């Protein structure tokens, strides 16, 4: 398809790598070195105390937080011999999840989805993984992630993570990331219930805006989930040299989990689509009531106004001098017409 | 025969720009025979014809250079899309200019046809005005390596000028989208819906134009014809990357405007309800009142309210009574 070259963009010097993003507040480097017996971890600010982990024997977890420090990213990639296009993809957050297989490392792009209750905003953050022979390299934007359970598992020798190699560490990271989508998709559920209750009770424009934010958020979730499932499928049915044969069933289980992730997001999508039509039915019902009011008023008071005008015209010849001058008779005629209209409306159950 | 489809026939001229490492020599003439014999010049020759509506000259020029009459059909075929065709003795490219107006948001387009031949490049334009003044400056004043390279580098420079103008057009579209974002979300206005429709239409036109240009540039560098030469492939590849960078922004802008339209059209039913509420409120509190006026405005004798306890103030107080009960009836149940 291509030869994996730099993008040579406009209005930007040729050798420039640019952080595409919004977060420029936090920078930290958390290293987590572990083995079957030993274990150590340390936060860091300078990168040079982290490079000597490229050549090692224990499985190491290097967590670079804050990719607006393009200098740190380039230094790490140069030490680990990572292709500059890969660093450019690391620094570009406007992309879907990916999986690229190289002769010495795998490069996985994933996305975390923090969801806030107020303002109903779906926030996204790119997290990038590079699996080298003994090191897993992680790049993030902000502080905060979903990998605390893994950290506890290393810290307390829980699970089986410390017996196995960096392939199992990569699996654990991807598994935790995928499992957080279940938290997301069960958070959305009660919000859907609240929307349903509100549309049953109070129809307004804010409900419309909320429902359409739900629709856009679910479309974005689908656009993120599908490439994620394809990435896991590629990690599974390709058997790269870096991932051993005993790690494949775990990736199979992650793919399985992604299945019902997508299934339940589809169910949420069409149930909120139903809430939309419930809304339209309710608002049309209210408009029907008010239009019934208006048409009842008009139906009664157009003909009576017409009759008042007719008997109120000024011609030289008038029917006044008959039927006991007919003024109470005329009023009784108007009353009879109004009563007939009212009972006809009530006959058709017209509110 | 040859027929011109466009709507620009007001002017016509021919501009020539020959150059070499030694010197440059330019013409601005009107005769086809004068510009005819530059084909065999060893130095690069740039030929510009500002009027293609004059089918006579555009028919005459292609006969000498040896271009198949299908490209003659396409050059005067204004209603087209960007495309590139390779031939044995030449290559034929069709591109689009774009003129935008801030005061009147209409996206005007002019078609440009490029014929790269051996040591000669032919340009065909509809109206006056182009995007190649910087290339003229480089040619006149030795501002780059454009003088040291052959006609393929000229084709590069002209396509690069076109994509630069596309970048400027993107800047203007960005300004318009920035204004319309607030003008739509913050306030509703009658002009804003039409403005959003026009913005969507212009972005559709841009999208329909840009992707063929991307395919054209990919054809230019990826599969190399003998004309382009190997040294010029990196340059056309850079232009292809610029086209990618334009297309991505076009998609993003289209998504933004589509979201604006979706919100506006989702906010319609309750607006209908509110207008109906206003009309029903107005009609309910006035039609019976007009009836009350008319019923005592009848030409009936022996009516009881001749002067019965100040009949006119009594009627007016009655009007006030029904008005008050009607207005409080709505507020209790909240219409």
């Amino acid at each position, epitope marked *: 398809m291509e030869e994996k070259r730099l993008s040579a963009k406009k209005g930007l*010097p040729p*050798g*420039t790598l640019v*952080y595409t993003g*919004k977060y420029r*507040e936090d920078f930290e480097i958390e290293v987590m070195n572990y083995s079957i017996e030993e274990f150590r971890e340390f936060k860091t600010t300078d990168v040079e105390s982290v490079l000597p982990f490229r050549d090692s024997s224990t499985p190491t977890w290097i967590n670079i937080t804050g990719i607006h420090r393009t200098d740190v990213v380039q230094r790490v990639g140069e030490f680990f011999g990572i292709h500059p296009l890969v660093l450019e993809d690391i620094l570009n957050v406007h992309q879907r999840p990916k999986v690229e297989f190289f002769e010495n490392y795998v490069f996985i792009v994933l996305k975390m989805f923090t969801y806030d209750k107020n303002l109903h905003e779906l926030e996204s953050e790119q997290v990038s993984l590079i699996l080298t022979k003994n090191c897993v390299l992680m790049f993030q934007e902000k502080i905060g992630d979903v990998f605390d359970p893994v950290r506890e598992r290393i810290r307390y020798n829980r699970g089986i993570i410390r017996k196995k190699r960096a392939d199992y560490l990569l699996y654990s990271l991807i598994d935790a990331l995928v499992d957080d989508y279940f938290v997301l998709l069960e958070k959305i559920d009660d919000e859907i219930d609240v929307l349903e209750e509100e549309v049953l009770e109070r129809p307004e424009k804010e409900t419309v805006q909320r429902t359409h934010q739900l629709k856009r958020n679910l479309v974005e979730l689908r656009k993120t989930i599908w490439p994620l499932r394809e990435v896991l499928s590629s990690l599974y049915r390709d058997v790269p040299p870096l991932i051993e044969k005993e790690t494949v069933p775990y990736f199979r289980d992650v793919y399985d989990h992604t299945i019902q992730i997508a299934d339940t997001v589809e169910t949420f999508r069409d149930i909120v689509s139903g809430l939309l039509d419930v809304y339209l039915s309710s608002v049309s019902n209210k408009t029907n009531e008010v239009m019934k009011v208006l048409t009842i008023i008009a139906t009664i008071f157009m003909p009576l106004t017409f009759i008042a005008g007719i008997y109120g015209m000024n011609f030289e010849y008038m029917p006044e001098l008959r039927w006991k001058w007919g003024y109470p008779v005329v009023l009784a005629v108007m009353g009879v017409i109004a009563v007939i209209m009212v009972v006809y409306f009530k006959k058709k159950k017209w509110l | 025969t040859l027929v011109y489809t466009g709507k620009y026939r007001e002017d016509f001229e021919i501009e020539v720009m020959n150059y070499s490492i030694e010197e440059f020599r330019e013409f601005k003439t009107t005769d086809v025979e004068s510009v005819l014999p530059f084909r065999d010049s060893s130095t690069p020759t740039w030929i510009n014809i500002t009027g293609i509506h004059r089918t006579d000259v555009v028919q005459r020029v292609g006969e000498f250079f040896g271009i198949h009459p299908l490209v003659l059909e396409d050059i005067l075929n204004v209603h087209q899309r960007p495309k590139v065709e390779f031939f044995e003795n030449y290559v034929f490219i069709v591109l689009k200019m774009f003129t935008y107006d801030k005061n009147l948001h209409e996206l005007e387009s002019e078609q440009v046809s490029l014929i790269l031949t051996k040591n000669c490049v032919l340009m065909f334009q509809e109206k006056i005005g182009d995007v190649f003044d910087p290339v003229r400056e480089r040619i006149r004043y030795n501002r780059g390596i454009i003088r040291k390279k052959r006609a393929d580098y000229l084709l590069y420079s002209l396509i690069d000028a076109l994509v630069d103008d596309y970048f*400027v057009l993107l800047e203007k579209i960005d*300004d318009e989208i920035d204004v319309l974002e607030e003008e739509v979300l913050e306030r509703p206005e009658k002009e804003t819906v039409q403005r959003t429709h026009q913005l969507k239409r212009n972005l559709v036109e841009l999208r329909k134009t840009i992707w063929p240009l991307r395919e054209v540039l990919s054809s230019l560098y990826r599969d190399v014809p003998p004309l382009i030469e190997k040294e010029t492939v990196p340059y056309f590849r850079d232009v292809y990357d610029h086209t990618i960078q*334009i297309a991505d*922004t076009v998609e993003t802008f289209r998504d933004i405007v589509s979201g604006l339209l979706d919100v506006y059209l989702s906010s319609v039913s309750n607006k209908t309800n509110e207008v109906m509420k206003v009309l029903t409120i107005i009609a309910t509190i006035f039609m019976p009142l007009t009836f009350i006026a008319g019923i005592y405005g009848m030409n009936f004798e022996y009516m009881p309210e001749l002067r019965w306890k100040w009949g006119y103030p009594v009627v007016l107080a009655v009007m006030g009574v029904i008005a008050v009960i009607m207005v409080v009836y709505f507020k209790k149940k909240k219409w």
Partner: antibody
Amino acid sequence: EVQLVESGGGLVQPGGSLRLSCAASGFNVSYYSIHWVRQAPGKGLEWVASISSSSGSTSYADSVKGRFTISADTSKNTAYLQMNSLRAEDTAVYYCARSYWYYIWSYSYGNAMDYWGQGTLVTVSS
Amino acid sequence: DIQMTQSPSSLSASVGDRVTITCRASQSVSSAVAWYQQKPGKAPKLLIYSASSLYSGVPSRFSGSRSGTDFTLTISSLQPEDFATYYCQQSSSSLITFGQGTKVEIK
């Protein structure tokens, strides 16, 4: 920790020359762009030149173009401004700044200046 | 090139009231506008970039926004540390220019 230090500023005869040395510590000048901004006494800031050390890209203002010269030294982690054909209207305080690129749209990029040096005063008179 | 016309040329205000400084562009500067604060004898400090993004460490009192071609800097609760000169700077092209400045003093 990240700092920029300027030197070379002084009193120079008109039509003269001097070189300004921008000593950068705490970062590598290869990964960032370096700018030169001056400020005449009592007048506002004005941007002079820029250098992208890794790629060699240089840009100049018209008031100094073809008359100034910006350069970089990767080994010494410093950037220079050369001032030739000096006029008396080039007298100012010369700042060295460091900028990063950020993303707005695909076609659009902007850069902002984080850190500055305390500046050097250049006088061109007598 | 591009001219940044920054108005007003100077301003006097108290502590607590909203201060708004406006900058207009000659032609389209697609959100590439940054705001700086300079105090006499000191190097300028960065406040806003991308016309709406708060630089790290800057107080939340400072705010920026764009409406097409014109840009505004807003200080919601002016404080004694805010009395300085404010500049608008564009970086849409490689030849980047500043505004003329705006001096905010005590009413």
